[model samples]
Target: GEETRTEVEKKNYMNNAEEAKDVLLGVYRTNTLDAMYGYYLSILFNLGTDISQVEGSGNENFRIIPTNSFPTTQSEVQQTWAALYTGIYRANDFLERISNKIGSYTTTDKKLATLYIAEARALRGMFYFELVRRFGNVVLMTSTQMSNQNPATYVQSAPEKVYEYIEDDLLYACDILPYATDDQYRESNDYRFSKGAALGLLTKVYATWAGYPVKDESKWEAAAKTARILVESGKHGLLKDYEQLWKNTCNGTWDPTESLIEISFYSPTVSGNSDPVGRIGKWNGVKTTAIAGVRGSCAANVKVVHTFVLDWREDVSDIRRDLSIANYQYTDTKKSLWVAGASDTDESAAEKDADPTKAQKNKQNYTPAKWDIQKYVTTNSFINNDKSNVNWYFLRYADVLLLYAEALNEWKHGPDAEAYNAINAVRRRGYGNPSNTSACDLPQGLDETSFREAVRKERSYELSFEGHRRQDLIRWGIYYKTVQATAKELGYWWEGTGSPNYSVATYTEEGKHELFPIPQRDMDLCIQFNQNPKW
Candidate 1:
């Protein structure tokens, strides 16, 4: 819980490798600790979308989401890379030290060590995947060996090179990991790695790496084969009932085979992420269907609402539209959840939340319904008091299914029935199509290209506020074109009002804004860690 702990702190940390794992685990599920607090904030930190949170001083150059003023800077992006590697260091230490634990222990002690080591490998792959996706190259640290003082040199090789290292870890962990944990949320609190999580992340590893524009187009086939192995093995599947899969407690009502890997959370408990989302935004000018009584806060990206709602498009009558966004709004008034402070609108909402003695301002605003707008209170907004139990699904089985489909499609674009069934599985859930089509069905004849677009919008809708939008867009090459089209329609272009509530200038450039700069300040500590490209 201290700000930082040295590798040499405990007798248990016999070597740097063992100590590194200990350090990594310490930060793995940090509980309000100073060193870890920043990392937790970064969950919602680096994601770019229509969302933005209020900035604190230490994060001046980091743009959680892009805007006219929030230019991508070196220091901002670098902070994330630094944290991931630091975590890798800890994982290395664990791998080194834990074997020593096994040597000294009795049979009973070895059994416990086995469990802990599985957790360690799972944790190691977790961070390594994050590192590879962002920077494309990482120090393939399979041991406790700390090399150069320079952060740049620390990167052992290109990401594909590191994949072999991660695969080995997950391979071991997946073999030994146990089945469906008893925890109430999506996954288990049995933080010591369970087998499913290992496999789930492995799927993410294969899917993400294969999708990367590397030299090998065949990797997609390899990735799909890996996922198909899981399915044929009967370890995972799509949840029969889609909605129940995301409930506060998704146990009996849903199928367990659906969630292969998920970051479990519980409020007032182990997960110290009360206000999962940071940064403040406005509601009056925005449109949203998320809040319960719905006055308003940031609404559907103007583009999303019109594109889906007004045009009667998206092919499927996605009833979940009501869930993601109201899609229509009372444009000129305050009509959403009001954060007691920061939402400087609606006098009544402001007064309702105002402390008379302190004279605080409460404004009518909006909170993303996807994150529980019904119970959202500003006090818990920063701490995530309400959704403490809501597990952040880093990897889900359904995703694997869709990912398998995408990889297969990109690989050969054949097996029409195979691809159709895969795409349809996700669509049926989104469109509320039961296996027994007696209820309702997609109007028929949805083709490949159309289904591809459907999958993108489906993910955007179903996974809207889950912190996946921006990357999903980038990976699919839709961010640039989509955002440009969005500018023409839903963009919040303020008429030079200067009220500080909306975008001041228009996006005159193309939206293909790629790799953000390194977090400049982080570069101060390690010379090897440099900016990405043209910052």
Candidate 2:
């Protein structure tokens, strides 16, 4: 009776365009799931980079400690691994069943079906890309038939093979997907991938392939050409004001031109559903305890590294430093914003010295202000404190410019005029001027090494806590030295006691820390799956 019931239920599934769209939505929903981009991918995995660190006091064994020291059984690691596969399986299932259903549709519906197929392929490609980069070698399952197979029989695919698989999927999607300007789904589906988004992802994939463990130098030219296509296409450009762009992003306003791919999130107050809400601004946002009027009530877990704060201020005229890192936190109903490194008045100094708690609080590292959760709480009403509608940006036009600049320098062996223009455009925007040259532009005539260093530093300055620093360091083959050096400097500043930064530095190792260990639970199930080196 049970077998007959299941066969009957499966008879009409994916039998029409409407039903197929529903399954496609399921694939999209996985990207915002807590274990995926909503939390782990967007925030937790990005912690302990040169620019930011987890704020709370925890032992080296804490689950969220992502520096170099997380264990194989780390909860985030296991959840992220499962979540990525969940998306892949959803995509695979849809791809397997959609072909039988598409033949039954009308001509217009067939066109819609083709677009849906491209979108699903792009999503699957992205899932695999995230997997191979984080876990090195991973299981690549493309069809639903593999879903019924035993886990113990599965074998790990090499990272290069996985990357090639991803490239093929994305290339197919790129050919089929329409550009953003011509998207028929734009009315309510800006979150859906566009041609530009697919190109942006392909560029990143090629750039990553050219770096670190892969070291496929030929991919450098491919990266440059792909990125240059997006840059010259005229479909995307920087928003006029950086602050306004972020404000718009936090408020769920879509800037389709600048933000190529974004994961849509909703507030419990607005969506009336908790399952799809995100912790974007709440977890890694500016700290505040105010209950009314821009109510940011959660304690921020990520703070800018002290050394980074000092280094960011080296160019005092750069407007991004103050906007990206908060100088003051809110308490109750009082709001006070101070300039970093401003000289304290004698009376204020005396008051702080007399109250040791105040002095300690004032000396704490600044939290990330770029995605202030308070901005998401526009209306003065009670809402979920730990959730916000701030959408997580997966790819932005600014990132494309920098990637193109970096790829050009690496490919050409020097910074040419086009390379200078690409990087200078980003820097000019950082100084609050996007169209004209400013004093912040990189000096001309730098050789390959000098320009390479400039582009690297520019990435840190412009994209600090937006979840790219750790990967950038790893790709540059400098994660170990950079983390260790920062830790040494932090140790000197703190005299080597009571600082979490000091503890994290002790666990930093050269070869082992670059790749996260394959989750141990998976290793237990899949006898053929070997652990990553030095786990």
Candidate 3:
């Protein structure tokens, strides 16, 4: 089993046995899909400020023009896929080379190696999800699919076909990946993909399919059922206090089991820099508030901030904003603007000290407290391109609860008491209960519609400024209508969008904007790689 001959190391094999050697070489790297191949695509999907035109008002506005006119953005779409396929190709090659690897590998190193191969496959599936989300129906590939120096130009397959491959890989991943105690590198956190994580990805996969155009909408029910198991399994629970969730020091590394998966970063490893989160926090620039990252000014929208402000019906008692968000910097500002019950503001004070002009002038919205930078914790740029030491939880336990709540609401039209219990349990943790004078009132009604609205607004206020606003806003069927109405109220379509060339209705298309353009460059490379309409 150990007789190894990686023709790649042989000096004259290329010349002496050309065709055979190339085939062998492809088979040699059958497993590993390193960052260059997979991680690059992850970064791309979560487009930077420069990649998306939505940042129509920032310093990089000119850079957000349409892809047809600005060719590079178009090129990035294809380039990102090319990078993902690079990883997939490597994985495909590795699986071919070590056909016996999975059966024989039992030792820790061997198990890790085998697990890594699955990781690559799962990652490939993830990339495809983005690809399909951006460009429906992508070309299918497998270990046996033969190709040469030319990029494969096969026709696109339906999402169902792609789903088969993705599900196969992820299910296999779940089987082989280690359980908590069985994991070899407990300290690394990088090494293991626990059962919860696998289920998390699966939940997201179905969750994604449910949101996208699926032939069977029942997948949403399946996803909710799966999420229920995760929560029922008792592997994860909500972090008791909220503010601690936004820690900046070593403490901020919120690695509770509830965190399904987290994209980890640390200085001197991967991208070498301190935590960009410090610079990314709304309180950045001022030393007292500035923790790390050089540049920071983003905050929660006003609508969200107001939702979290304590609103105990005057006779109520324990109504206090939970620790989910912190407001040390804003509490000092204009006292009169703070009110209870009436204001459903998302963004609160951006730490009144920040651009005092803006903070003093606008007391409606709130600052992003989670991305706070602590000088002692994350010294680099984790929040803004700094990619320093801060760790980001891509999915967490709280989300699981919400997913279950939403699914139940959708499944039963929100009448299920279980759904109400799910959403209310979370709300009970936060402040602003109209009933309770001493504490945040427990969510009283378990009605489907109201509870659904409660969960939606709660998630919006709680998770605001954590990089998920746009997606959530879109999924809720409110982006087009709300922004349009907001535009009329604000005199323009919305803030960050009054620029000369900007159009508030750009994302107005029903099915299109929900999906991104099938990177035009990908289409250029592949024959009839049908461009997403309007790209």
True lDDT of residue 411, candidate 2: 97
What is the clash tally of candidate 1?
51
lDDT per residue for candidate 2 within 1-535, as digits (tens), equals 1112243464577677677787788889898888887888898888776787776444444324655567788877899998888889888877877887899888777877888898899999999998988889899987766856999879999788998999998888889888888777434557888788989999989999899878888988998999888888888888878787678778778878788888988644644544677888878877778465546476577777776766676797788887888856666754444322246664575564334234443444468888876654454433656776778887888888899999999999998988898999889888989345558899987999999999998988878788888888888899889888888665554533365343446677888877888999999999999998899
**Candidate 1: segments with Cα more than 4 A from true spot:** 1-9, 13-27, 30-64, 68-78, 108-112, 141-156, 181-192, 238-240, 249-256, 266-317, 326-367, 373-390, 433-451, 491-512, 522-530
* Model 1 lDDT tens row, 160-257: 67777777878888776565553232233333445656766676677666653333565667777766666566655666555555453211122356
Query: Candidate 1, TM-score vs. the true structure?
Result: 0.69
Q: By lDDT, is 2 or 3 better?
A: 2
lDDT of 1 at 27: 44
lDDT of 1: 0.48
> What RMSD does model 1 have?
8.7
Summed backbone clashes in each candidate are 51, 0, 53
lDDT of each: 0.48, 0.78, 0.46
Q: Which is superior by TM-score, 1 or 2?
A: 2
lDDT of 3 by residue, 1-535 (tens): 1113343543223222222224333422221122221222222233221102122322233232221123325545556556556556655655554454444544544545555555555555555555554455677766435434255456778877787677777777667666443466433444135666766667666665666454346767876877776777766666655554556222346454556655443334443322222222321111122224443333322122222232211323322232333333322222223221234243433333232223321323323345444422434333433233444555666676777787777777754666666666566554433355234423455576787776766665455444444455544555445444433433331234332222333334545554456556556676756665455
